[PDB]
Amino acid sequence: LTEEQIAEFKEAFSLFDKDGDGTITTKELGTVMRSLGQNPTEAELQDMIIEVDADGNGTIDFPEFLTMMARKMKEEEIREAFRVFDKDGNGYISAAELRHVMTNLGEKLTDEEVDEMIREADIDGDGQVNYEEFVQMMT
C-alpha cells in the first residue's frame, strides 16, 4: 500500500473509533451504523467483526482494518465518493443526483439549499459539479 492510501484508510478508521483508542468494537460499529439509520442486531455486528478480527481478540485494530481495506482495493475513496453522487456516470453531479444522495443519507433538503450547494461548487458555471469541482469543495 502507498502511504497516501494508508493515510486515507487511517482517516476512514477514525470515523468509527469513537474513543480514539485505535480499536473498533462492535458497539462503535453499531453506533456508526445506527447514525446511518441502519438497525444492526448483535448477531450482525459480531458477524462483521468476526470476519475482520484476525487475532480473535474481539475488536478490530488498524492493521486488521487495513487488511480489509486492502482486500477491497484488489479507486481512491474520494473517487468512489464522487461516483456515489454521480449516479448516471456522466462525470457531473446534477441537482437531482445531489437530492438523491442527501435523501439516501438522511440529509433534509430544500431546492434553494441544493442550488446554493451546487452554485458554490460550480466553478465553470455549467450548473453541475464535476469531479474537479467536487474535490475542491471537499478541501
Binding site: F16, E51, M68, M138
Partner: peptide
C-alpha cells in the same frame, strides 16, 4: 456557505462505504 453540508455528506458516505466493506467481508 454550504461547504459544511457538502462535507457532512462526504463523511456519511465514507462511513456508509466502510460499513458496506464490513458487510462484504
Amino acid at each position: 456557505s454550504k461547504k459544511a453540508v457538502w462535507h457532512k455528506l462526504l463523511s456519511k458516505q465514507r462511513k456508509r462505504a466502510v460499513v458496506a466493506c464490513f458487510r462484504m467481508a
